[PDB]
Amino acid sequence: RPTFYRQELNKTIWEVPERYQNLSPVGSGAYGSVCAAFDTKTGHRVAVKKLSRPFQSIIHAKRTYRELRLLKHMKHENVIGLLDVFTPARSLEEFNDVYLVTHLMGADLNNIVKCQKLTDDHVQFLIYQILRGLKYIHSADIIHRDLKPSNLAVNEDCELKILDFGLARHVATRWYRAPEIMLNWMHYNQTVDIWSVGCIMAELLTGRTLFPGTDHIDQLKLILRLVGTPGAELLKKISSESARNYIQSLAQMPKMNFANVFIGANPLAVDLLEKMLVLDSDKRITAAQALAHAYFAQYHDPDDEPVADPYDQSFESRDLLIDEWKSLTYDEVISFVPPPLDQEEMES
Ligand SMILES: CNC(=O)c1cc(-n2ncc3cc(Nc4c(F)cccc4Cl)c(COC)cc32)cs1
Ligand SMILES: CCCCCCCCO[C@@H]1O[C@H](CO)[C@@H](O)[C@H](O)[C@H]1O
Ligand SMILES: CCCCCCCCO[C@@H]1O[C@H](CO)[C@@H](O)[C@H](O)[C@H]1O
């Protein structure tokens, strides 16, 4: 067991192994509090995330366990991978905090979009990497649920990683969210993530948020203006008569021609955007289909787009006591094994 030390940053107490020095805040959010640090054992900068009140309620306890299970499973070049997991607790009875460590990226995608106007080639490589990491996530029967520029970060080579997963089941921008999430549809497709990819791609191409809604209804207002009011084939799938009547009451909006909306973009990029930003989720392109789209011809390698090991998420169906959730999390902390050092990291 390493020696821990305590330190206050922007009003939150941090207790970490001595290996981690130079703690500086990165951000404070609903996910948790996040610091940058220098890992004196590896010589790399890391991001450290302290779970906020992990066992305050059944919901929070399950959500803590969910996040740790998820992150322990993720081993892919374009997905956040866990370098370390620790708690200052010496015993399960003392167990009340969880810290998660990953490599510190250079910049998130809000900062790249504000820093430069990306070339088409850059947009290809960034979106390709998101879809590559997404193929992996969907292959484990996971929906990310919260792809957005601040959950996407890159290094000096524009190598990209998908970060924090959406932990809601059954503060946080709406701008990249699939309309069916906002409307309580309840049996979501993995293609909610594909909707979010399309919103991101649009923004990378234009420099501007595609759908910057002011609130929940505005968000859907802006979506329907671009993709149109729902077609007959989609209306067939909506049980509620009152819901259909309200839609039929709207000013009927046609789908806009994306070639005109994104005028100047690579026609292949526009074609791919049309296949992502479809209202009907059954008709959105999948991550694996999108990687085979001609827009990615320069980067697509069918033999280097790996899939995930099966992911046992039978826990999602459990209703357990808070003490069991806390206990199962603690077992996961204890059993964690750090990945190996890279080959490039060692010499002769
Ligand atoms: C110079 N560098 C920069 O400015 C930036 C670096 C990053 N960056 N790099 C990695 C990383 C990981 C997380 N989350 C996290 C974590 F900290 C630890 C373990 C697990 C997880 Cl999911 C977050 C917070 O989520 C938004 C930001 C992160 C973002 S801007
Ligand atoms: C008031 C206008 C809102 C329109 C929202 C679309 C209605 C979505 O409603 C959904 O329809 C699904 C299929 O019938 C059901 O499975 C879901 O329970 C229901 O919420
Ligand atoms: C009708 C109000 C505007 C929102 C349209 C969103 C339609 C999303 O598409 C729907 O996704 C559901 C899964 O969530 C599927 O069950 C439905 O089959 C599919 O049509």
What does this structure look like?
This protein is α+β, with helices and mostly antiparallel strands. It folds into two domains: 4-104 and 309-335, 2-Layer Sandwich (Phosphorylase Kinase, domain 1), CATH 3.30.200.20; 107-296, Orthogonal Bundle (Transferase(Phosphotransferase), domain 1), CATH 1.10.510. It is 35% helix and 15% strand. It contains twelve helices and ten strands. It has a five-stranded antiparallel sheet, with no helix packed on it. The chain starts with a strand and ends in a 13-residue tail after the last helix. The chain binds the ligand CNC(=O)c1cc(-n2ncc3cc(Nc4c(F)cccc4Cl)c(COC)cc32)cs1 and octyl beta-D-glucopyranoside (2 copies). The site of one octyl beta-D-glucopyranoside has 15 residues, from helix 4. It is an enzyme of class 2 (transferase). It catalyses: L-seryl-[protein] + ATP = O-phospho-L-seryl-[protein] + ADP + H(+); L-threonyl-[protein] + ATP = O-phospho-L-threonyl-[protein] + ADP + H(+).
Helix/strand order, N-terminal first:
EEEEEHEEEHHEEHHHHHHHHH
CATH architecture of the largest domain: Orthogonal Bundle
Number of strands: 10
Gyration radius from CA atoms, angstroms:
22 Å
Shape: globular
Query: Which sequence of strands runs across the widest sheet?
Result: 3-4-5-7-6
Estimated share of beta-strand residues: 15-25%
Here the CATH topology of the largest domain equals Transferase(Phosphotransferase), domain 1
**The CATH fourth-level homologous superfamily of the largest domain:** Transferase(Phosphotransferase) domain 1
Helix amount: 25-40%
**CATH class category label of the largest domain:** Mainly Alpha
PDB class: transferase
Keywords: JNK3, p38 alpha, Kinase, selectivity, transferase
Assembly: monomeric
Entry title: A structural study of selectivity mechanisms for JNK3 and p38 alpha with indazole scaffold probing compounds
